[PDB]
Amino acid sequence: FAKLVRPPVQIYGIEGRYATALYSAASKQNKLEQVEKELLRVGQILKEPKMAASLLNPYVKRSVKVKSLSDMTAKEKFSPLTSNLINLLAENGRLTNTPAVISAFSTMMSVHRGEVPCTVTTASALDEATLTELKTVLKSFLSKGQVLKLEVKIDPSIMGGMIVRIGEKYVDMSAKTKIQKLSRAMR
Amino acid sequence: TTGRIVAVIGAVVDVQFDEGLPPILNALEVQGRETRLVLEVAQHLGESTVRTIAMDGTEGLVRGQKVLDSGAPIRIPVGPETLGRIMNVIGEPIDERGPIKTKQFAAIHAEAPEFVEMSVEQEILVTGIKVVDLLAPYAKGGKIGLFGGAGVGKTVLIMELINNVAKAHGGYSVFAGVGERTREGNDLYHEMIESGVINLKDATSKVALVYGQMNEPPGARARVALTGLTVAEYFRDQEGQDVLLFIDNIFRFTQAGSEVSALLGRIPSAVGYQPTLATDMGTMQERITTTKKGSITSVQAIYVPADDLTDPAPATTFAHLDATTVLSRAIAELGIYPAVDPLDSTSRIMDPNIVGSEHYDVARGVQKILQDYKSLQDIIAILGMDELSEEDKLTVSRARKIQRFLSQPFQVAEVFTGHLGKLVPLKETIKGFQQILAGEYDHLPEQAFYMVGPIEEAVAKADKLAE
Amino acid sequence: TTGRIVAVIGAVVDVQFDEGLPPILNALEVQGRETRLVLEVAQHLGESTVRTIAMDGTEGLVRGQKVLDSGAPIRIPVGPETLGRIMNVIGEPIDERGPIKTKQFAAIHAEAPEFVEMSVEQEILVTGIKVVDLLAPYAKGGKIGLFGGAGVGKTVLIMELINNVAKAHGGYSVFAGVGERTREGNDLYHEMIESGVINLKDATSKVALVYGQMNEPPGARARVALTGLTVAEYFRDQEGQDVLLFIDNIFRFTQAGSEVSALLGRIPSAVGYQPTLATDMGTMQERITTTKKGSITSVQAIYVPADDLTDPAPATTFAHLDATTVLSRAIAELGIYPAVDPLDSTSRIMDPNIVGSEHYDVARGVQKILQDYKSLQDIIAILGMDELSEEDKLTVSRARKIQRFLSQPFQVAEVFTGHLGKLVPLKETIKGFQQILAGEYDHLPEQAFYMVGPIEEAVAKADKLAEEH
Amino acid sequence: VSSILEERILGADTSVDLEETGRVLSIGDGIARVHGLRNVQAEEMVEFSSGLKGMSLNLEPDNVGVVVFGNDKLIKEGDIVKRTGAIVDVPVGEELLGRVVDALGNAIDGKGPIGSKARRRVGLKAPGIIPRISVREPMQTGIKAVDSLVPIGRGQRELIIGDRQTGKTSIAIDTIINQKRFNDGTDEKKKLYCIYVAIGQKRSTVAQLVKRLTDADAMKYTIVVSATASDAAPLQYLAPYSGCSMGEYFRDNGKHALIIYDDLSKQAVAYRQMSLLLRRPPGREAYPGDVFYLHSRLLERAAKMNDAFGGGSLTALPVIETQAGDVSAYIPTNVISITDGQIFLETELFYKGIRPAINVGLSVSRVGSAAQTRAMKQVAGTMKLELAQYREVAAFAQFGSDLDAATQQLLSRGVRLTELLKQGQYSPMAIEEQVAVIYAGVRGYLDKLEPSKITKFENAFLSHVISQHQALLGKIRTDGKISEESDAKLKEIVTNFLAGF
Amino acid sequence: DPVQKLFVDKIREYRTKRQTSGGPVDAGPEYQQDLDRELFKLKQMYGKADMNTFPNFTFEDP
Amino acid sequence: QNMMRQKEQEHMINWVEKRVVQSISAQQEKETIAKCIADLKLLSKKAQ
Numbered sequence A: 001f002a003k004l005v006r007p008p009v010q011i012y013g014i015e016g017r018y019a020t021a022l023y024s025a026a027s028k029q030n031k032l033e034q035v036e037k038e039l040l041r042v043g044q045i046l047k048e049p050k051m052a053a054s055l056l057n058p059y060v061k062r063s064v065k066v067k068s069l070s071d072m073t074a075k076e077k078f079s080p081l082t083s084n085l086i087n088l089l090a091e092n093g094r095l096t097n098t099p100a101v102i103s104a105f106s107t108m109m110s111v112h113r114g115e116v117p118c119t120v121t122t123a124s125a126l127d128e129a130t131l132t133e134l135k136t137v138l139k140s141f142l143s144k145g146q147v148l149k150l151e152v153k154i155d156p157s158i159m160g161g162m163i164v165r166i167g168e169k170y171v172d173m174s175a176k177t178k179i180q181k182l183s184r185a186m187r
Numbered sequence B: 001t002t003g004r005i006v007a008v009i010g011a012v013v014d015v016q017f018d019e020g021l022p023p024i025l026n027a028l029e030v031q032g033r034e035t036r037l038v039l040e041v042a043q044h045l046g047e048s049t050v051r052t053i054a055m056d057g058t059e060g061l062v063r064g065q066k067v068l069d070s071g072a073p074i075r076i077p078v079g080p081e082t083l084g085r086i087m088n089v090i091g092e093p094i095d096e097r098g099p100i101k102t103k104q105f106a107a108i109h110a111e112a113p114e115f116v117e118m119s120v121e122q123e124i125l126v127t128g129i130k131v132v133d134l135l136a137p138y139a140k141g142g143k144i145g146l147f148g149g150a151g152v153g154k155t156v157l158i159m160e161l162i163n164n165v166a167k168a169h170g171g172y173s174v175f176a177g178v179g180e181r182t183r184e185g186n187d188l189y190h191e192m193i194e195s196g197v198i199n200l201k202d203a204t205s206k207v208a209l210v211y212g213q214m215n216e217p218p219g220a221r222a223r224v225a226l227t228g229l230t231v232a233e234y235f236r237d238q239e240g241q242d243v244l245l246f247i248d249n250i251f252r253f254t255q256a257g258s259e260v261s262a263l264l265g266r267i268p269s270a271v272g273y274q275p276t277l278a279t280d281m282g283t284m285q286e287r288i289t290t291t292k293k294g295s296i297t298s299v300q301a302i303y304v305p306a307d308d309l310t311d312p313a314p315a316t317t318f319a320h321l322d323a324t325t326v327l328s329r330a331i332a333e334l335g336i337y338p339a340v341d342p343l344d345s346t347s348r349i350m351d352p353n354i355v356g357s358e359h360y361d362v363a364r365g366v367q368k369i370l371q372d373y374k375s376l377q378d379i380i381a382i383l384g385m386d387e388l389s390e391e392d393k394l395t396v397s398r399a400r401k402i403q404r405f406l407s408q409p410f411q412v413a414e415v416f417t418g419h420l421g422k423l424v425p426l427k428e429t430i431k432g433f434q435q436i437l438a439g440e441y442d443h444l445p446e447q448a449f450y451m452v453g454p455i456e457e458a459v460a461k462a463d464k465l466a467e
Numbered sequence C: 001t002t003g004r005i006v007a008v009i010g011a012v013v014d015v016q017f018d019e020g021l022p023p024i025l026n027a028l029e030v031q032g033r034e035t036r037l038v039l040e041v042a043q044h045l046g047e048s049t050v051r052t053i054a055m056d057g058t059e060g061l062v063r064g065q066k067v068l069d070s071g072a073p074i075r076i077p078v079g080p081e082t083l084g085r086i087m088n089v090i091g092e093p094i095d096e097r098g099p100i101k102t103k104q105f106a107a108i109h110a111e112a113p114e115f116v117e118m119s120v121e122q123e124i125l126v127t128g129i130k131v132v133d134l135l136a137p138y139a140k141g142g143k144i145g146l147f148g149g150a151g152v153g154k155t156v157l158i159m160e161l162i163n164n165v166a167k168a169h170g171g172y173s174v175f176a177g178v179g180e181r182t183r184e185g186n187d188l189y190h191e192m193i194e195s196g197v198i199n200l201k202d203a204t205s206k207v208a209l210v211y212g213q214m215n216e217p218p219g220a221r222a223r224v225a226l227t228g229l230t231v232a233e234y235f236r237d238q239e240g241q242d243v244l245l246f247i248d249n250i251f252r253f254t255q256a257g258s259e260v261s262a263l264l265g266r267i268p269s270a271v272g273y274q275p276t277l278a279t280d281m282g283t284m285q286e287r288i289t290t291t292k293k294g295s296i297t298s299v300q301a302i303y304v305p306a307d308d309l310t311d312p313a314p315a316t317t318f319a320h321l322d323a324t325t326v327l328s329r330a331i332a333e334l335g336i337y338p339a340v341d342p343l344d345s346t347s348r349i350m351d352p353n354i355v356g357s358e359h360y361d362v363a364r365g366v367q368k369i370l371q372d373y374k375s376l377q378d379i380i381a382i383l384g385m386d387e388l389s390e391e392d393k394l395t396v397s398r399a400r401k402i403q404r405f406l407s408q409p410f411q412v413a414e415v416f417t418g419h420l421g422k423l424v425p426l427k428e429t430i431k432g433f434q435q436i437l438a439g440e441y442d443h444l445p446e447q448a449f450y451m452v453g454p455i456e457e458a459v460a461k462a463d464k465l466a467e468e469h
Numbered sequence D: 001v002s003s004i005l006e007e008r009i010l011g012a013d014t015s016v017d018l019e020e021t022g023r024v025l026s027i028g029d030g031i032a033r034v035h036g037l038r039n040v041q042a043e044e045m046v047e048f049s050s051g052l053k054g055m056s057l058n059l060e061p062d063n064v065g066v067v068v069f070g071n072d073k074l075i076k077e078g079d080i081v082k083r084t085g086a087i088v089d090v091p092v093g094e095e096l097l098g099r100v101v102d103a104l105g106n107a108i109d110g111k112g113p114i115g116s117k118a119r120r121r122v123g124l125k126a127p128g129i130i131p132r133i134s135v136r137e138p139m140q141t142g143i144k145a146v147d148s149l150v151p152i153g154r155g156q157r158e159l160i161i162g163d164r165q166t167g168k169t170s171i172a173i174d175t176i177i178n179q180k181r182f183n184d185g186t187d188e189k190k191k192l193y194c195i196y197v198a199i200g201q202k203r204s205t206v207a208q209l210v211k212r213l214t215d216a217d218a219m220k221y222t223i224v225v226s227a228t229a230s231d232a233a234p235l236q237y238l239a240p241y242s243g244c245s246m247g248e249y250f251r252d253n254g255k256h257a258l259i260i261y262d263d264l265s266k267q268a269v270a271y272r273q274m275s276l277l278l279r280r281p282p283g284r285e286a287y288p289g290d291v292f293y294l295h296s297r298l299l300e301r302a303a304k305m306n307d308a309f310g311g312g313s314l315t316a317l318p319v320i321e322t323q324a325g326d327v328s329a330y331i332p333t334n335v336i337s338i339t340d341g342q343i344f345l346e347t348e349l350f351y352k353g354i355r356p357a358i359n360v361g362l363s364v365s366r367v368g369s370a371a372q373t374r375a376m377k378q379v380a381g382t383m384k385l386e387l388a389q390y391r392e393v394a395a396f397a398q399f400g401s402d403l404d405a406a407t408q409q410l411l412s413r414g415v416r417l418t419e420l421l422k423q424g425q426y427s428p429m430a431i432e433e434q435v436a437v438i439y440a441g442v443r444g445y446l447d448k449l450e451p452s453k454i455t456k457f458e459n460a461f462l463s464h465v466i467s468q469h470q471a472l473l474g475k476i477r478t479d480g481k482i483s484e485e486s487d488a489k490l491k492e493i494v495t496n497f498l499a500g501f
Numbered sequence E: 001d002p003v004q005k006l007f008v009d010k011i012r013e014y015r016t017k018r019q020t021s022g023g024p025v026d027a028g029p030e031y032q033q034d035l036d037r038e039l040f041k042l043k044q045m046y047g048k049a050d051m052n053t054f055p056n057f058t059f060e061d062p
Numbered sequence F: 001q002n003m004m005r006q007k008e009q010e011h012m013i014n015w016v017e018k019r020v021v022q023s024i025s026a027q028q029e030k031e032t033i034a035k036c037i038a039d040l041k042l043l044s045k046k047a048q
């Protein structure tokens, strides 16, 4: 079939297939940013009580749902790509997992703009100056151009130290795990 | 074109090409290994992914390695320089003697000869062995089947057939060891080096060994008979000469196929065998035929599981066999070598329309006399020789003489008996037996014939030992 | 925590959690149930879901019922306060006598003793049964199995072992009925009350009971074995005692697992058994071994479907036993009760170093003669007995005498045969079989040896039979 | 103690590292479905957060199916799985001899830790076709029947097949004990470093076994791997390769080893469980399609290296259990078509009194005459022919009389030879004593002696030879042939002794 | 090496313990019970002879 | 003696780790963060 441009990250399942299709189609025509904007919009537009209620009942003829989606997309004035994707989901019957699609697409667009996820789980509350130095040093792990998306977390369940996730890379320097390690190597 | 691995489930890899897929049966090289790992496509699963069966151990493969599409199915060297060498399924030598320097290459997946090519005249392959060539004649381009177990001279018979065909018909041979125990593989290599069919010094070898060991993954034991078929197809086509092809064993070909089919998830058939058993055997037993350029005989060892001759594997093999050679142990105790049984060995071409009226009458008479002697054996054992008249004792004497005369001294077996190899031509065998049946030699001691070639040598031996 | 039921298929409940999931093997209490319903987690289906096997009927469960995570696996009472008290799979009394007032609770899913703890000693046990004590002596504190199909005598034989060894045994005892008739439940209960091993007045009981009889759901038959095993494990370790542990059957455990395996989404193995048969049996049959802290003599009645000893269940269980006494129906239909097969039966302590030359050679002579008799039967089938040799008729007569002599009237079989129970000290069994093999009784009739204890009773019976002649 | 605890604490590795990681999606039945681990090699050792191990066996496109090395009670959906990057490997060396290790080479014996220096993979390839050299030396098992009728050379796979409780482990342990005489002596070209892999057995059985070995002081050269019944399926599926690698160390170090798998039909069951839970397609009897590749790639490591690769060796005696002589089942035929022989055991023979219950009719060895010493060859050729002749007409035994004196002679010789082959338990005999006994048997020096007494004779004869004529036995042993002088001396000893009894 | 506070933490817990080693601190009567049980079992495995002298034999001749 | 030693060993352990968990509540947060961040600094410095 026609060559398609692969995403940067691979997501799997139904949402994986639909998100990959949309991403490759958008890369052609270069409409990625506005496509993501419209995806976020349809997010809410599909959460209104009437729309979210008529798109779960399975006794609404499929064509009825398709036409209602078409009308709503005309009112919201979406790009041809996003309207076609909403249609596609509508007639394939897989619109019940539309939120899975857009979410996946976000994860595919984020990595396109190079914002690696991160995470710092701390022994307890943490200062900001400490957070400043943490960010400044973690930026040392990225590649040339990437950005950091750091989601701090407090955790008294661990004893001390901290856990740092960067993409997949995972460095555990919590006093807890040190205690288990010493007890193990000691037993 | 470079795809990427995306799954490694056991010995089944799954690659994801993008630009353009490789057609089924193409060989892909996995980049980043030190041992050459070769996958062979087997399906297309949509989404520009292909499910490949791996031809070697798939431990250490990483989702995302690069797999480079070769372009054509598994390719092997097929020159005359593949003679006296050992090469595994993908054509890589494993004799630790260097590269197989050849100018030709052949794909192991080539379709059978078209209908116009097929030769319409059923000939007879003169093996030079009295018993085989008389009672169970081997046919050119026929799928002979060699029954019998170990300890009864099955390797010696193989080497003798190789030597005799190389001398008489001036045609080379091959040996596709499907599922070949490594110990027995080494032993066969050194047996051939001894007997001289393989020669390491001068490049005058008559065998092109191919070995798919018993530990190599299942995907590479199903395709180790196609490698032999291709090495032999080169000789038949590009050199127009007769060829042998020993497939030891032909029950491990079906076993390897069944394992591969199970791995690809296909529903098992009648007795757990693959759903494509008949066609898998057909697309390999159908290149073993005599075209107009040359011919590929084939002597395939057969294992009959649980003595089930109805079992789907020996029931699908027998639909192709054009002969049989039931090596037996009970005939080895008497010392009659080769141990070939005369009363079990069948042959589809043992018909007077093909061999000739003289050959057929002689062979049928030998069979009848041997059956009658086997019957009288019971009466003699139970009651005693007294119980028999001379009208039966004459048949008994003739039968003992014939049972003796069927034994032959092989050339390769010189190490055992010291006697000289006798390549008795077909006419001499026919004359000898037609005469021993006509009573012309009812007086010579039986040991006159034991381990001789023609009948004239038997006369000379009788004269020698009678003084 | 607190989750919700999302699906109820058969006897498998999938529960969705929003808080932290409960680890595998935990116990979950379904709220709003008149009778306590306890589920056991057995998977983590992903998406913050768990799949659980229910220990009681799932009638009335409603999608959305709230479910409380207990925190730890099924915990049951243990101690000397569970003696003479019948218990459920979840340790709650079913004898209508009020709660089990204990101080220690134990979790049924424990670990096996490690290799360093194993005890390598073994010494014969005297069950007072001729065939068992002769050809398959039972090691003290060693796993023992009673194979054989249905209706051969497994339950009667375990009743005999309870009657003999239990009372004559100092330390405590446990009987964990797994998936067997509820009638036998109270039959055993009343028999034990009569014997006095269970007292409903004083705290002098010696036998604890556990019952998952076959009317319970499959989820509660795969675990009652672990409940009884836990009680006995406590009596071994914490009480520093020696214990008897009777289980009957222990094939309803693997069958009960097989019943729910398919619903848990597992491909079915060889004969419909769950794919995990061998290891699910190993993780249980290896908490029963004797260790250096205490001793457990475990007697397990193993069913055998359709009398096929090749079936995966018994075929696997054969590796987890010291002494295996294979009851046979071919021998039970000759009236030779106990139906034990003298040739299939085996023991680990049948080595002359552990039973001595006299006993070992008597046993091997018995086995040799029985096998030779089996060989001759093929000929007697064609010839007829008259045309036999003259030295053979001797061996056939001796084999028949021995075969009849291995029968015995049990103390619990007084209602079947109307006989009186007999016990036979080991030395006497050896004496009798030595004499029979040597030919010292070659003059007596065969029917003199049928259903008699020591050989002297055989001679007395021969007399009393010849008088009325 | 305390002072020791100080360095116990100090002697640690506190350092941390930047390691890859994936999080468990699912768990149950002992099979984690980790998500992530994008750079995890197939068949690699990952570690869960709790502390378990796992072998990332099934790399699916979106998740990696890992198999836990223990109860997954400790694992939960959400845990962290950190890869180690190293294929499964195990310790090796001569430090293991005398220890008991589990499937991963961790001393389960107490008795201190293993002091091994060099580790080694478990998924190596067998030596090719050139490294091997024909099987020539014998492996004296010490059992008359095995050692004379169905010989076992060094470098040969010899299935030990038979029903339940027929004495297969007993044959293996007699083989292990017999090697004591070599392993105490001097020559290093006859020392066998037995290994014993216990799969699916209960720890009580392995404990009793190590007790037997220690009593005979046969542990100083034996390793005993053990993946017992309670150890999760992967540790039973993986023990045979740990044993085979421990033996491959010796083999490629110019030493001679011997590895006994017991059973190999409880490893295929564990692999079947693993596969069926990973959801791989099933096959006949529910076994996957690899249950031949599985065994074949294991039993093809038993080689006999040539003299350029060291001269080492690795025998292999896979014990298989067949359900009521159903040799046609899947696994028995899978493992019968890989090995170089089979020592069939039967219960009809075990209870007739022929112990060890070897069934010489079905038992074969495909090396044959080779793998015997010239002395044992001379004796056993005639013994084998005589026994075959007796077997072919043993059907008449129950009559005997009313028949020709020739068949009467055949029966009177076969009965004597059958009684001579009977052997005790854990009483292996040096080859010279076997040769002496079977010489006294096959040359007619018992035909006039009633069968019931033959066993007596045997023992007496040994006591009358070992204590009296050790010089003759040494003469036979040092040069493994019967020179006419030795032949005549044996004849004189046999005749005069029989006269004196 | 003292940089890791874990080492010093363990070290001085250890020290305080050794100083307390004037007796086995916090043994707990269950400690004594375990001792009791296992010491008996060990003794029975070792027999009942007084573990203080050379038990005399006065060996018996034919 | 051997049993004495092993049992006292395990008891010493029990006690020691119990005191570890008891004591780690002590105030070392900022110090611990300082050392850990320096350690990440070293890990990154060796990273490239």
Ligand SMILES: Nc1ncnc2c1ncn2[C@@H]1O[C@H](COP(=O)(O)OP(=O)(O)OP(=O)(O)O)[C@@H](O)[C@H]1O
Pocket (backbone or CB within 6 Å): C318, C319, C347, C348, C350, C351, D163, D164, D165, D166, D167, D168, D169, D170, D171, D321, D355, D356, D423, D424, D425
């Ligand atoms: N040579 C012998 N002489 C006498 N008895 C023997 C002999 N060999 C084995 N036995 C007996 O056979 C019994 C079983 O032995 P063994 O455990 O070796 O067989 P097995 O097949 O390994 O058993 P399983 O299959 O249950 O593990 C033992 O109790 C032993 O007494």
Ligand SMILES: Nc1ncnc2c1ncn2[C@@H]1O[C@H](COP(=O)(O)OP(=O)(O)O)[C@@H](O)[C@H]1O
Pocket (backbone or CB within 6 Å): B149, B150, B151, B152, B153, B154, B155, B156, B157, B337, B338, B408, B409, B410, B413, B416, B417
């Ligand atoms: N023509 C022959 N003359 C004498 N002996 C033979 C002859 N052919 C075979 N034999 C004997 O049969 C045996 C065959 O052994 P081999 O060929 O190595 O394996 P297999 O027994 O499987 O054929 C040889 O050892 C040899 O003694």
Ligand SMILES: Nc1ncnc2c1ncn2[C@@H]1O[C@H](COP(=O)(O)OP(=O)(O)O)[C@@H](O)[C@H]1O
Pocket (backbone or CB within 6 Å): C149, C150, C151, C152, C153, C154, C155, C156, C157, C337, C338, C408, C409, C410, C413, C416, C417
């Ligand atoms: N010692 C015995 N004497 C007489 N009959 C017996 C004896 N043992 C068992 N039976 C017979 O077996 C039956 C009980 O079988 P049971 O053991 O309950 O079957 P299962 O072994 O399947 O539980 C009784 O009805 C009785 O006839």
Ligand SMILES: [Mg+2]
Pocket (backbone or CB within 6 Å): C154, C155, C180
């Ligand atoms: Mg019952």
Ligand SMILES: [Mg+2]
Pocket (backbone or CB within 6 Å): D168, D169, D170, D262
């Ligand atoms: Mg065994």
